[PDB]
Amino acid sequence: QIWLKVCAASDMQPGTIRRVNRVGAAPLAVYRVGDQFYATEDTCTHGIASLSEGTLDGDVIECPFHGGAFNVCTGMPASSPCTVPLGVFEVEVKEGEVYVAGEKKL
Amino acid sequence: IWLKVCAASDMQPGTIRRVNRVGAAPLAVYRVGDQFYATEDTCTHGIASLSEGTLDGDVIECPFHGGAFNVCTGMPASSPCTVPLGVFEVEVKEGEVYVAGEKKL
Amino acid sequence: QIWLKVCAASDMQPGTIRRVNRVGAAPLAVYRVGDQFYATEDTCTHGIASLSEGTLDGDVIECPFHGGAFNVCTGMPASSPCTVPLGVFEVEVKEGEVYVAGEKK
Amino acid sequence: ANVDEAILKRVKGWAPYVDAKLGFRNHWYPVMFSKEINEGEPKTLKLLGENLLVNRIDGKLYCLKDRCLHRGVQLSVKVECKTKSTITCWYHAWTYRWEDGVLCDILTNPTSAQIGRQKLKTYPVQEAKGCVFIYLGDGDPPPLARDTPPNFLDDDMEILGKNQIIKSNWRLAVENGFDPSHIYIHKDSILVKDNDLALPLGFAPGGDRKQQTRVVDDDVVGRKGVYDLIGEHGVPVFEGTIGGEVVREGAYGEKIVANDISIWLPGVLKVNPFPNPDMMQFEWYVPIDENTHYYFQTLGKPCANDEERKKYEQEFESKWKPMALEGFNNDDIWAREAMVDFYADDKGWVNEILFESDEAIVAWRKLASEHNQGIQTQAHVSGLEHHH
Amino acid sequence: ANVDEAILKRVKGWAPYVDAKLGFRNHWYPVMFSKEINEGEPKTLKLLGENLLVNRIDGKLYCLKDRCLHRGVQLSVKVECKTKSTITCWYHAWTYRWEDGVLCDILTNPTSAQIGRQKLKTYPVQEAKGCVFIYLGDGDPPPLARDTPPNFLDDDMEILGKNQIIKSNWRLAVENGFDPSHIYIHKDSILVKDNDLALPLGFAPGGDRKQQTRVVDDDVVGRKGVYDLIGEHGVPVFEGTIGGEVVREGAYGEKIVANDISIWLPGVLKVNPFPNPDMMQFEWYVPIDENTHYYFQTLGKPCANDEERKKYEQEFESKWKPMALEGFNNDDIWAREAMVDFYADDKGWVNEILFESDEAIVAWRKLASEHNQGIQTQAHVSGLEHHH
Amino acid sequence: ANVDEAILKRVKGWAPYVDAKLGFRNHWYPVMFSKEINEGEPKTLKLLGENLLVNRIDGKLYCLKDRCLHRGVQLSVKVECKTKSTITCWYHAWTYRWEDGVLCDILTNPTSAQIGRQKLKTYPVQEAKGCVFIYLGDGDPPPLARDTPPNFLDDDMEILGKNQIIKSNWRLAVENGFDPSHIYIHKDSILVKDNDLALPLGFAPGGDRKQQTRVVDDDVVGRKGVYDLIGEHGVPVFEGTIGGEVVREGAYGEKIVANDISIWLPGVLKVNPFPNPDMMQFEWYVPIDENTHYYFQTLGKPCANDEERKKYEQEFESKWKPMALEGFNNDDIWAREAMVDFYADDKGWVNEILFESDEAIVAWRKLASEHNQGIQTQAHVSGLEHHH
Numbered sequence A: 001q002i003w004l005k006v007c008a009a010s011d012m013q014p015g016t017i018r019r020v021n022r023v024g025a026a027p028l029a030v031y032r033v034g035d036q037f038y039a040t041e042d043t044c045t046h047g048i049a050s051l052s053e054g055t056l057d058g059d060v061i062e063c064p065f066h067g068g069a070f071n072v073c074t075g076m077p078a079s080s081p082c083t084v085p086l087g088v089f090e091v092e093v094k095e096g097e098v099y100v101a102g103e104k105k106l
Numbered sequence B: 001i002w003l004k005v006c007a008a009s010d011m012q013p014g015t016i017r018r019v020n021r022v023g024a025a026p027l028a029v030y031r032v033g034d035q036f037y038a039t040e041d042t043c044t045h046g047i048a049s050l051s052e053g054t055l056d057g058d059v060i061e062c063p064f065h066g067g068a069f070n071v072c073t074g075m076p077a078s079s080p081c082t083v084p085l086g087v088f089e090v091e092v093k094e095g096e097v098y099v100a101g102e103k104k105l
Numbered sequence C: 001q002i003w004l005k006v007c008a009a010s011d012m013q014p015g016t017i018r019r020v021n022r023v024g025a026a027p028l029a030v031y032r033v034g035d036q037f038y039a040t041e042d043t044c045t046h047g048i049a050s051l052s053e054g055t056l057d058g059d060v061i062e063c064p065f066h067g068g069a070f071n072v073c074t075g076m077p078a079s080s081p082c083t084v085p086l087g088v089f090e091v092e093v094k095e096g097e098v099y100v101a102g103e104k105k
Numbered sequence D, E, F: 001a002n003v004d005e006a007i008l009k010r011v012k013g014w015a016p017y018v019d020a021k022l023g024f025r026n027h028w029y030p031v032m033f034s035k036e037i038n039e040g041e042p043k044t045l046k047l048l049g050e051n052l053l054v055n056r057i058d059g060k061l062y063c064l065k066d067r068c069l070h071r072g073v074q075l076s077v078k079v080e081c082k083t084k085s086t087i088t089c090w091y092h093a094w095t096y097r098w099e100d101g102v103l104c105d106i107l108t109n110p111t112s113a114q115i116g117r118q119k120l121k122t123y124p125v126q127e128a129k130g131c132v133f134i135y136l137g138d139g140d141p142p143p144l145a146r147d148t149p150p151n152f153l154d155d156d157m158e159i160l161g162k163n164q165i166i167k168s169n170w171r172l173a174v175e176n177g178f179d180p181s182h183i184y185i186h187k188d189s190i191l192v193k194d195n196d197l198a199l200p201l202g203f204a205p206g207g208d209r210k211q212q213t214r215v216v217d218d219d220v221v222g223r224k225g226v227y228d229l230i231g232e233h234g235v236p237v238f239e240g241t242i243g244g245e246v247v248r249e250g251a252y253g254e255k256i257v258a259n260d261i262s263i264w265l266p267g268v269l270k271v272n273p274f275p276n277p278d279m280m281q282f283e284w285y286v287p288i289d290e291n292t293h294y295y296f297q298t299l300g301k302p303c304a305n306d307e308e309r310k311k312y313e314q315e316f317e318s319k320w321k322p323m324a325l326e327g328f329n330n331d332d333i334w335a336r337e338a339m340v341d342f343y344a345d346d347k348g349w350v351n352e353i354l355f356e357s358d359e360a361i362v363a364w365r366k367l368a369s370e371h372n373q374g375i376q377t378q379a380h381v382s383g384l385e386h387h388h
């Protein structure tokens, strides 16, 4: 479906990440940066790691396998060895419920 | 059984004195503060004289390879030393340092 | 002949170097070190570099090719790879005019 | 110890494994066959960077470090065993007991204070299934079974094999071994045609991550390992395609092999059944130094009597060894060698781009990182260094 | 990046050039002749430290990095071209398109998420005058003309040549070639006698420093280089003296050669006319790794039709290649090799004692330092590194 | 300079010696025999890591550094001696005087300002006793006698010998030669049987540590050395026992040799008498590089006239060279080679376990540390480095 209910916005602390599993599709990661919410593909583009098992530092997610990293707002690589941008998914808060797009931007 | 080494005042804190024994291997006497300790003089790792080494607290550093021993326990404190030193009983009695002619256990 | 008039003292800013060309002879370098003037051969003794294209650090000129260096007062090497001393020329400032000796030492 | 700290900081999932270039200390390792070491004829080898001497005395195996305490020469340059129970250094004649390494005599100076006071390093040695295992570690050893795969030590299991030195780091040999997708390199092996094997080109995995492996950290004998379960939910590939066109087919023979594949610390693979439905392959990748390993291959077949064993040996010689140990696994050897350059500067551990079947490899890296019994270091080789 | 920073700080005039041990990135370099690379026959080479594969498909040249994205093996250990437009790694069958390097199939796992989401590095390749040029650089290439000397690409200029691997750093080759005084080493070359050359022993320079060269940095096609003008105010040396006594003479032949000598980025020399008054020599010194270069020698002569081309080709094989490319330039090869030890630790760049003819070399060093299009580093070879 | 500072810090008894991997500067060293260099035939060698050229002009030896000032090539790649007194570099014809190293001409530019303003390094050379010595040092040399053992230079002493290159560091050679207990390795030498030597297996020391050696710090000729006195109060060991059983006997011949054994800076052993009562052996271990030395062996015998010398020459060639210099010292060569690995990472200098007869070695290390005339560094080799 177009918008996927994740959780209540209050169920995520600043600087945390939640994995969103999807029937028939690859998982997403939702990130809380301050009061804002962002989402990418959960699988690192450099390999098979889950970015939701990584470390968030401001708006940069660090992959747990090789220390590559991405900007979670843009999906662009921030650290080697990552070179392929992440798919970015729109997040909206409606009645304090977090929703993530089922299709990536562009 | 007891050898007369020196006056206690003859040795400054942090100093080492070699004790030659006729018919026997030499000993080393160490002053750590106001306490005294005695070990074999010969490093267990080779043929160095520990009395030519450097005392840092209760640890004697060998001049040959930088191995070290705790002078109270005779246990190695730095590589390459692995074999414990013979420890010899010390007594101060009447301003006089004495070393047991025999090793303790 | 001997003394050569190079320039007005004021024509050189402090910490700068001026090349003095001489027909039938090797160029000189005139150094202004604060309010004092010194003169050497211009050609680094290690190569073909012009010391006038180098870097003055106090009374030491650093060659621009290899980072060799010389004390501009004594001409002696201050940094490798320079090993052969620079020819030094006496300098006198008289009435705000810079004069350099005809020949060395 | 062994690798730039900037690389170890990047590989958060398995830094101890990446650091373990010289291998894991405090495990048993096979180094030769029993029949290669004869009564009173000492043999030299290098294990985890350390030069060792092995001798058979009254049929029992003893292992001393092949490095004199005095000036650090190898005793083996000129072996002088002057009594049954001793070896004498050729240089200044420091003499050591095989049994405990104690410096018991010095022929150049029998009054020396060193006599009885120094000890040369000894390691436990155990023979099992015609194979010589050395415990490259300190203190009383664990049971051999801890560091062997299931069934290897079975009473009825008859073990034959082959050993040789290979020019790659041991971990490249392990990963190649355990890698489910590497089956591709075996697609034209003579074993496939000439023993009528079913052999896919690869696997399309299915299920979640956890389902791809079974981690054993609860074996009763203390074995620690990983089973590769890719084929439990996976569709095996028998038709490989480019742009939708078939370009390659797997092998559609009758004989089903490699149902269960498992890797065990310290680095020994078990493939069951293989290379035939009634046999098993066990192979070790034993660290020699940073650049080399023993590829120690064994085949197991249950046997009930000398009739069955002798027939197994003839078949081993005429078919299994040439067709399988060589004809199949020779391609693994140069595959290992081909990875050397990427991982030689330790940057391969960061730059590798993994895909789905590498989940087996990752599970092994984590298992190895968490349950290894110590990291061998160059200081172990040269002589341990400390200020307490 | 490549050299001890204490050394770079000393060589203020040309630190980038001293740092460019692996060569200059983002230039065109010739690596082989067209006729050496046949349809569907991929060829391996190393350029600026990178292993590359070149292939010809429907007559066109394509260049891929010879290193699988997965576990970093060379594809060329066992080339598997399964369709005309792709290569399949022999290990796990990751499959890449020659035309853009896109990972387009994986035979061992057709469902893998990596498919279509990874790209193997490709480099532009262009054939001109029978020579294969690779742009070892990133993004859209500049015109080839930028990185070729004047006249190499002229319509009528017929180019023939030879290529070989020489064990020195590329910069030693460049400097030897452009060095006015090194002509001394050629005084007994078979070409001097057998082609009646006038050849001095060296030059006594005249005029000032700026007049010793012409620095070209305003050519419309963007080429950057230096002409050696030592002979414009210099007296050529025909009588070599020790203590005023003549111990060697130059060569007093009729044919005038080497009127203009120029060196151009990225490292190509033009000598005109040479080895004969109606011909030109162009030679490249192409960095392979820190210790080796391609010595890519070409001779150009205007030919107006096919009869002339064949005539030239026959003169080349029978005369110019053995007498000039070999008989003259063989001495350059061992000259280059003789400078390796002094520069190998990078200390020769500090300790060298220059004299006046080295003004040309210094002009090149400063040109190359200012106008190169980037410094190749070991990280370009292994994988670029950056921490947020 | 040369060794990890953490190792030099540990070896407080003899840090300069441990640091002296390349040898000691500012001493004389023998490098070849006089008869090996003829008039006007320059000879290359490497000494303390420096490439050198030696020439004989009007009977006299001269030594130049074999490295052109200009681009650092070896002149010896292509020797051009164009006048009796000069050598001309093959590359750009820089010309140097043998006598003082002055750059006196440049054939490629006779107006160069470098002429008369640069000096190629020279070293003093002296022939004595048929041997060529080089002072590998700066400034005015001391007398040769300073760096030779007592009696080597006596008027009557006839010296014959042999030289070869050995693959160990020079210090391992010195220590092996001076080591009292190393005699064990010679127990089966053909010399011992065929020249009926008495040769113990070793020595049980007697007396105190101080009586085990005699250090000479002489200031008449300035020689510096140590005598081995282990046999003065020591008991010769003629039977080797293990666990109280005799396993080996020494040699009970009549001839008593090696009464006095002394080692002298810069590293020359004297054994008197040897290998026969009427003769002495002097042997140098001359550093070539960190891994290599000249084993320069000489036998000396006082001879009064020509027919004594002639006779000595015949006995040397027929007997002493093959039985002693080879038949005895060949075992010293492979013993030295056996210590390389342990000392190669410099860790042997910390991890060695010394016993009583090593007091001689310790006395040498301390003597050498206190009285050497300079440590050769890698910077002496490439060019001395200093920043203001």
Ligand SMILES: Oc1cccc(-c2ccccc2)c1O
Pocket (backbone or CB within 6 Å): D176, D177, D178, D179, D183, D257, D258, D261, D269, D271, D274, D281, D283, D329, D332
């Ligand atoms: O190292 C190994 C040794 C022998 C057989 C295999 C194998 C694995 C999977 C499928 C078929 C054979 C293997 O990996």
Ligand SMILES: Oc1cccc(-c2ccccc2)c1O
Pocket (backbone or CB within 6 Å): E176, E177, E178, E179, E183, E257, E258, E261, E269, E271, E274, E281, E283, E329, E332
């Ligand atoms: O690299 C080179 C290749 C060919 C010719 C020359 C040359 C230059 C000047 C005079 C004579 C020949 C050269 O330098």
Ligand SMILES: Oc1cccc(-c2ccccc2)c1O
Pocket (backbone or CB within 6 Å): F176, F177, F178, F182, F183, F186, F257, F258, F261, F269, F271, F329, F332
């Ligand atoms: O290698 C050597 C060099 C010089 C002397 C000896 C020697 C020492 C003691 C007794 C006999 C010979 C030796 O072995």
Ligand code: FES
Pocket (backbone or CB within 6 Å): A044, A045, A046, A047, A048, A049, A063, A064, A065, A066, A067, A068, A069, A081, A082, D350
């Ligand atoms: S898998 Fe994320 S950085 Fe490699």
Ligand code: FES
Pocket (backbone or CB within 6 Å): B043, B044, B045, B046, B047, B048, B062, B063, B064, B065, B066, B067, B068, B080, B081, F350
């Ligand atoms: S002899 Fe004391 S540390 Fe070696």
Ligand code: FES
Pocket (backbone or CB within 6 Å): C044, C045, C046, C047, C048, C049, C063, C064, C065, C066, C067, C068, C069, C080, C081, C082, E350, E352
């Ligand atoms: S030319 Fe001046 S330091 Fe080299």
Ligand code: FES
Pocket (backbone or CB within 6 Å): D068, D069, D070, D071, D072, D073, D089, D090, D091, D092, D093, D094
């Ligand atoms: S090195 Fe073995 S006894 Fe001396």
Ligand code: FES
Pocket (backbone or CB within 6 Å): E068, E069, E070, E071, E072, E073, E089, E090, E091, E092, E093, E094
């Ligand atoms: S290394 Fe090429 S597909 Fe695995």
Ligand code: FES
Pocket (backbone or CB within 6 Å): F068, F069, F070, F071, F072, F073, F089, F090, F091, F092, F093, F094
């Ligand atoms: S390198 Fe010797 S003259 Fe140029």
Ligand SMILES: [Fe+2]
Pocket (backbone or CB within 6 Å): D176, D177, D182, D183, D186, D329, D332
């Ligand atoms: Fe395999």
Ligand SMILES: [Fe+2]
Pocket (backbone or CB within 6 Å): E176, E177, E182, E183, E186, E329, E332
């Ligand atoms: Fe040339």
Ligand SMILES: [Fe+2]
Pocket (backbone or CB within 6 Å): F176, F177, F182, F183, F186, F329, F332
């Ligand atoms: Fe000897």
